[PDB]
Amino acid sequence: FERDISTEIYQAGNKPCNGVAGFNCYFPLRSYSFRPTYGVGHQPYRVVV
Amino acid sequence: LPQGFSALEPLVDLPIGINITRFQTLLALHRSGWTAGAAA
Amino acid sequence: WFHVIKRFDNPVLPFNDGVYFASIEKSNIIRGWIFGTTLDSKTQ
Ligand SMILES: *[C@@H]1O[C@H](CO)[C@@H](O)[C@H](O)[C@H]1NC(C)=O
Numbered sequence: 404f405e406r407d408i409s410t411e412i413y414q415a416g417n418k419p420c421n422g423v424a425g426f427n428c429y430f431p432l433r434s435y436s437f438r439p440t441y442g443v444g445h446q447p448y449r450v451v452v
Numbered sequence: 453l454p455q456g457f458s459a460l461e462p463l464v465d466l467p468i469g470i471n472i473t474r475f476q477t478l479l480a481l482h483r484s485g486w487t488a489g490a491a492a
Numbered sequence: 493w494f495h496v497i498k499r500f501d502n503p504v505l506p507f508n509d510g511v512y513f514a515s516i517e518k519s520n521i522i523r524g525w526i527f528g529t530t531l532d533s534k535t536q
Contacts, residue, residue, distance in 0.1 A: 404469055409535065453514065470536040473529040474504050475511065479496060480523045490497040491517040 496521060504531065 409431075412420040416427025424430065437447040481488055494501050507527070515522050529535050 405471070406469060411534075471529055472507050472527050474531060475507050475525060475527045476504050476531070477502055477522060478524040478526065479500075479502060480521050485498065488496065488498060488500075489519050489521050490495075491515065491521045492493065492495050 411431075412422050412424065413429055413431040414420050414427070415429055418425075418427060420428035435447070437445075479488070
């Protein structure tokens with residue numbers, strides 16, 4: 404039950420990213436991009452616990 | 453700190469859920485620099 | 493042990509599995525507390 408909303412740039416390698424994208428510097432968040440043409444496994448689902 | 457025994461009754465429970473690593477106290481300064489009381 | 497009287501010592505103390513806080517005081521100098529990780533606006 405831990406929520407993390409930090410937008411700091413992930414440091415994949417050892418070179419510092421300094422908040423900008425670069426070599427071994429990827430944004431921690433990706434987009435699902437839900438589409439009807441996608442497969443059943445890739446289809447969006449709403450989960451309530 | 454005096455001798456003796458005393459038990460602390462529960463006071464509050466909050467579902468805040470955030471990660472905690474550091475803390476700092478808060479003082480009530482009075483302007484009558486500044487003049488403040490003595491506390492420990 | 494910290495004393496306030498000038499004596500103005502409000503450092504950022506570390507947090508751990510728990511904290512025991514004691515205050516010998518009169519006239520309510522100590523008011524409240526702040527908790528967090530980076531103590532800035534970036535984190536909760
Ligand atoms: C809580 O925050 C501190 C300071 O940013 C960090 O070092 C620690 O890893 C965090 N806790 C978790 C479980 O990530």
